[PDB]
C-alpha cells in the first residue's frame, strides 16, 4: 500500500488516514518514531499561531491602533520588547499553555483528542460531516498560513517593505 500523495513511497504505518489532512505525506517518517497525537497537536498549534499571525500582518499593515505608533509589523517586535506589551502577550500565552501542559499530558495518557480543546463557542461545528469538513479546512489553512507567515517575514527581510506595499510596486532583486 503506497502513499496516496507520494506514489513511489510506501504509506507510513502510523498514518492510516483517519486524521484530517492525512494524505500519506511523510517522507522523513517522523510519525514512525514520535507519537502521532502529539505531532498533530504541535501541527495544529503551529498552524493556529501562523493563521493568527498572517491575519495580524494583514491587519497591522492595513490598520494600526491610533494610540500605537505607525510602523511595519516586523520591526514593531523590538518596540514591544522595549515597551512591555510583548512581555504581556507572551505572559498570557504562557499562562494559557501552563494548562496546555496539562492538556498535553492528558493527550499522552490518551484521554483527549489531538488539538481538541472543545473550543466551539458559536456552535459552528456540530454535525459530524460538517465537523470533518471543518477539520480538513482547518488543517489546510494551517499549513498554508504556516508557509505564508515565513514568506511574509522573509520578504520583509529582503525587500524592506511590507506585504501589500510590495504588491503595490513589485520590486525584483
Amino acid at each position: 500500500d503506497f502513499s496516496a500523495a507520494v506514489p513511489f513511497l510506501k504509506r507510513p504505518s502510523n498514518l492510516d488516514g483517519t486524521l484530517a489532512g492525512d494524505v500519506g505525506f511523510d517522507p522523513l517518517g517522523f510519525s514512525d518514531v514520535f507519537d502521532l497525537r502529539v505531532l498533530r497537536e504541535a501541527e495544529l498549534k503551529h498552524g493556529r499561531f501562523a493563521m493568527l499571525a498572517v491575519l495580524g500582518f494583514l491587519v497591522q499593515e492595513v490598520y494600526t491602533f491610533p494610540f500605537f505608533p505607525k510602523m511595519a509589523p516586523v520591526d514593531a517586535h523590538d518596540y514591544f520588547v522595549t515597551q512591555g506589551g510583548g512581555s504581556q502577550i507572551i505572559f498570557w500565552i504562557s499562562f494559557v499553555e501552563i494548562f496546555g501542559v496539562v492538556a498535553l499530558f492528558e493527550l499522552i495518557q490518551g484521554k483527549r483528542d489531538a488539538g481538541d480543546f472543545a473550543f466551539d463557542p458559536l456552535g459552528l461545528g456540530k454535525d459530524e460531516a460538517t465537523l470533518a469538513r471543518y477539520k480538513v479546512a482547518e488543517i489546510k489553512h494551517a499549513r498554508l498560513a504556516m508557509i505564508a507567515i515565513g514568506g511574509f517575514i522573509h520578504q520583509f527581510w529582503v525587500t524592506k517593505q511590507t506585504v501589500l506595499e510590495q504588491l503595490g510596486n513589485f520590486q525584483s532583486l
Binding site: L9, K10, P27
Partner: peptide
C-alpha cells in the same frame, strides 16, 4: 532530493516494490 530520493533509496534498498529509478 531529501524529500524524494532518500526515503526512496531506503525503501528500495530495504526491499520495497519500487524499482530503482522509478518515481511514478
Amino acid at each position: 532530493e531529501i524529500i524524494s530520493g532518500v526515503p526512496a533509496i531506503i525503501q528500495t534498498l530495504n526491499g520495497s516494490e519500487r524499482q530503482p529509478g522509478d518515481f511514478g
